[PDB]
Amino acid sequence: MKFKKPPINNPSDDATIKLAEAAVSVSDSMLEMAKVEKVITPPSKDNTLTIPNAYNLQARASVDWSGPIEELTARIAKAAHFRFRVLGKSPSVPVLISISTKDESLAEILRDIDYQAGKKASIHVYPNSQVVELRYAKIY
Amino acid sequence: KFKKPPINNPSDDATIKLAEAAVSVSDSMLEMAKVEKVITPPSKDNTLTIPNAYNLQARASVDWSGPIEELTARIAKAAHFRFRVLGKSPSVPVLISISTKDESLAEILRDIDYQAGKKASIHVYPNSQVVELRYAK
Amino acid sequence: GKSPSVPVLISISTKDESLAEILRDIDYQAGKKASIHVYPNSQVVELRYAKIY
Amino acid sequence: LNRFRYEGAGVVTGNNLRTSYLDLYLANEGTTRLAGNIGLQKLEAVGNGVTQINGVSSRNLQIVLKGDPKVLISGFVNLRQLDMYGKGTLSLYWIKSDTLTIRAKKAAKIQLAGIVNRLDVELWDFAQFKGKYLRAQRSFVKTHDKSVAEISAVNHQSSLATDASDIYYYNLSKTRADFMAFNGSVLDMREWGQSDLKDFDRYNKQFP
Amino acid sequence: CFHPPYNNFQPDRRAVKRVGVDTGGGTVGLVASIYRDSKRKIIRDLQKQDIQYVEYGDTRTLIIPTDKYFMFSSPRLNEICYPGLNNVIRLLNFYPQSTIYVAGFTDNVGSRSHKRKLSQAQAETMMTFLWANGIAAKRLKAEGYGDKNAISDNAIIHGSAQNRRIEIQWFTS
Amino acid sequence: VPKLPCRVDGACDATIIKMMTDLNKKGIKVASVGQNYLISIPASALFADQSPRLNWASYSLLNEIAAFLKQFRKIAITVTSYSSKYVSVKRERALTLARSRVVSEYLWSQGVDSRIIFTQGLGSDKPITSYTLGGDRSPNARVEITFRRAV
Amino acid sequence: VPKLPCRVDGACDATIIKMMTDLNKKGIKVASVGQNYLISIPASALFADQSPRLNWASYSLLNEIAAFLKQFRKIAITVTSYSSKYVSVKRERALTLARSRVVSEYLWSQGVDSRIIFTQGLGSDKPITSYTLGGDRSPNARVEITFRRAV
Amino acid sequence: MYVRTNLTILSPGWLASMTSADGTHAYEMQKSPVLLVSWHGKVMQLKVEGL
Amino acid sequence: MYVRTNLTILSPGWLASMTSADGTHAYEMQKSPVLLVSWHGKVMQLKVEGL
Amino acid sequence: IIYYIQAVIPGRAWLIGSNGSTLTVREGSKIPGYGMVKLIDSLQGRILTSSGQVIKFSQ
Amino acid sequence: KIIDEQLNKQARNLDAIYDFNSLVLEHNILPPVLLEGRNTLNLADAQSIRISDRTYKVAKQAHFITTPPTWRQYLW
């Protein structure tokens, strides 16, 4: 008639304990960071306008990439049967994007890729032209 | 006959909190980028529209790193167009480097317009077969 | 208000009292550093720090 | 007027009738043409007849029949329950209710549209129910063999299928859960070309 | 026979195979069957599993670990614990009268809106799985609470693991 | 070289040709051409009738094909689903998309270190048999998982 | 090593769970959910008929309660008393308040290392069952103590 | 140390770089026994001896 | 000596005290092998080694 | 003011307003604040007006 | 060795949480590190103390960068 609390796991490690102790404070800092930033500025623009969805774009893609963007978007365009276009020069500093996502839509993938690119590059899609297009930032 | 559990199972109390915190901080950074990014509508994006005349549908392979006017004049020569210029060249001429193996001529001109910035622009008349380059103030 | 850099340390040793006189004795041992107010209509217990220095 | 019972192959046509309540009992081809706003709570048809009613502004009603009528109904009526045991065909324009319970046994072809928060649907065999454009916050569907359901759930979706049954939803709910035993199938059936299509979220990635 | 996927949501016939292979007699098979089917043995099997049962007055409650019995950060069902799930259905078959309340609970970390959404989705898919066995929908109500009242302490890693849970209550009348 | 790997970890070519021999004896189509590889599976051998539901006995074969798949080194894996003609083109495309989605997410749950996994379905648009008497029983109803081995 | 303690003094968890088992088989309800522990005692095992007089034989049971209770490490304890409806709200709440106060004072006099003890009685406002056949023999007349295990 | 390769270095910093017409790279940096490279979207480590 | 805790020091007297946003305090003081603190309304003693 | 769609049928649509107003509209009629309705789409919740405004489902 | 192989086994979440590339400015320049403090009091001697409500300071000055850092030089 013995007593047991429910949660049973494998034994842990003190390094992982310290990892959790750092991670909770980092997550709180980023939480209040995003909260204060959303308070400070009003959003006005959405990238769903500039890259709308299309047909033959609902094939799912689960992806963990840990490098630059060019080979990734070329592979994406090859899977999407669309022409691929590049505008501007790649700078001397390479642009590196890390992605770990579970099989969502390709338009969502492109929107998130452009979001993580931010000020470095821009993405446009012409489905009437069946062309995906990258454009680098002109700066300096 | 046997369904197997996943290999990368977060089967530890520290690991589930670690992965949950990673998901939360990734969401926070994503929302930061969402509220931070400034973009443009594709209605009024200042880019060269394609006149899609038949002389521009050919292909070429061009490597270049230098000025602009002689390249545009040679492009108009290959397209059997005429060349027009308005404005004056600056003290430092505009330098554009293009390396490509296969393209469209209109794609070449569009990327030329993209790399030109605000100091110069182009116009195509496909009826009277001409291309014009305009300087700024 | 805000608690000062020097913390306020309170030593209580009593037995079997009601919460009203518990709060009264807390206030009396508090001295001038803080004050206690109540609002039983709104069910509110409030501390306030003294504004010195 | 309070009571109308017709039997024996007749046709009644009327327009601009207003009444608080009357009870209707139709049998043996009572061909009804009505062009007025009538409130009522009970209407019983035996079956094998047509009925044109344009406008029922009533708080509540109850319909139960065993035959195979052809009924197309306009108005804004809250219902409580509905049961079908024959070869029933029905279409309704607007339903503004709170909770509905639909049971279909033998052959049902019922088309509905409206805003009802709570829906419970039971299908036994050879019933094709179309709650397309019928937005529902809560939905609970159970289908047995040879049953077709078209749903428009908004917030909370519960789907259970034994076999031989098709469950097609035309809106991505905020919560979706489903189970199929032998040959039931739940499908998205959407367009894949909508300019404003919304995708899954973390909570909505319920992999079937 | 038997289907490991929940026997396709059908009322199983389990002890008849046991008494058949016992005869291959019938009386000793039946008394062993009802010795297995004693409710104390059901509680003993549920305590062999990681499920906590509390009886108090006319109210009975069950506690289920979200992490072991559910897929992580997702409303996906963990497929392994279906013997315990069948035991849950067998125990819950005894009370066809009273209403049931079901609730989800999480830890303290993240957006409060995110906690609310995950807990509510968790409670809704739990009650949906329960409704799939044949319970009346009018007898049910679900709530996914966030970190509103932690029965453990979220200061420790172990306590924060112990916090997240599924709580099922039901009365007698 | 004593402090370097002699081979890739968990690699045996004899095991690889053994298991591809076993799968060819079972009937799953294993195609090797260049460094690109195709695996074709019939629909009835994995799923239920006209339904995105998996038999519990199929998990041994799915674990075996995942064990073969995690041997090699790859970047992108393509999954394409094909079916018969049952109700409508939308119905068949949605069914193939759902089946491909389920098998792809289970394959990524299993430990094969891909970088990109693409999943899509087409229904009965591209059959491989003129003989189309069966439905799910017909061999043109299938699932194809393909890649190219890269060094 | 021998200067620093190895454990909390006077603590043996095997003895703790053994006396928990013996107390539950005696009839006193022990509840352990999370870090919170609750002890429920019937009022007929403690007092006389609606009167706050302590039984002489109940002191051994109270000694067992204190001996189990001082095993833990705690900060604040809370004890509440409940009864059945007899005359009023006032008489019943007064009886529960008096019983809770006297048992809390004896426990605070006894050797349990805590910081805070809260005591209250509520009379007959919130029972646990609708079976109101008995009086003080009815199980809704009860005394509960509650605490949370700390660190 | 000066390294000719074709991939992209990640971790230890680098004083200067140069790229060919074919995309191969040459880097000049301070000495390090171990470098980090994203090969094809997957990270990789390289060990340098003889320093 | 420089100590870091979210507790409250009583006995020896410190030269300076500062706080974090989480309430964790840091103290600069002189060397002393035994500390007196309050944990949760209870008084404890603490050891300082390496002196 | 801003109106929202409530129920969509081929032929007629339901308008719910910010003042709580309720309206049933045909395929083409004059509507307040938006001019003239020219198109009803029953596949997707999009109806465009003569003012160019397209009404969607409220959130 | 045990803690290093555990560190390598828990691989992707470190780079997931330490996304340093988002912190970099437009001109590929490392943002600086800022120190905070609240409710500070320094006693100079007897009869003389000084208390500030909050304080902030610069730990390391912002400078240029070529490639972003990671967790490997810190935790290994």
Author numbering:
A (entry chain ED): 23 to 162
B (entry chain Ed): 24 to 160
C (entry chain DD): 110 to 162
D (entry chain EM): 113 to 320
E (entry chain EL): 42 to 65, 88 to 236
F (entry chain EK), G (entry chain DK): 38 to 188
H (entry chain FH), I (entry chain EH): 311 to 361
J (entry chain Ef): 208 to 266
What do the study authors state?
Using 3D variability analysis, we reconstructed a total of five maps that displayed differences in the way the outer membrane cap (OMC) and periplasmic ring (PR) were positioned. These maps led to the identification of an approximate 16-fold symmetry about the center of the dome positioned within the OMC. Within this dome there are 16 α-helices that appear nearly identical at this resolution. However, we have unexpectedly uncovered that the Dot/Icm incorporates only 16 copies of DotG into the OMC dome out of the 18 DotG copies in the PR, giving rise to another symmetry mismatch within this system. (A) Two DotC were observed in the maps that were reconstructed during 3D variability analysis, one which contains an N-terminal extension (DotCLong) and one which does not (DotCshort). In contrast, the N-terminal extension of DotC was modeled as two relatively large helices positioned near DotG and bridging adjacent asymmetric units. Notably, this portion of DotC was only observed in either four or five of the 13 copies of DotC observed in each map. The movie shows that the OMC dome, OMC disk, and PR of Dot/Icm T4SS can accommodate various orientations in relation to each other that suggest that the complex could undergo a ratcheting motion, in which the dome and PR rotate back and forth about the central axis with the different regions of the complex tethered together by the physical connections across the symmetry mismatches.
Legionella pneumophila is an opportunistic pathogen that causes the potentially fatal pneumonia known as Legionnaires’ disease. The Dot/Icm complex of L. pneumophila is one of the largest known T4SSs. The Dot/Icm T4SS has as many as 300 protein substrates, a striking contrast to the H. pylori Cag and B. pertussis Ptl T4SSs, each of which transports only one virulence factor.
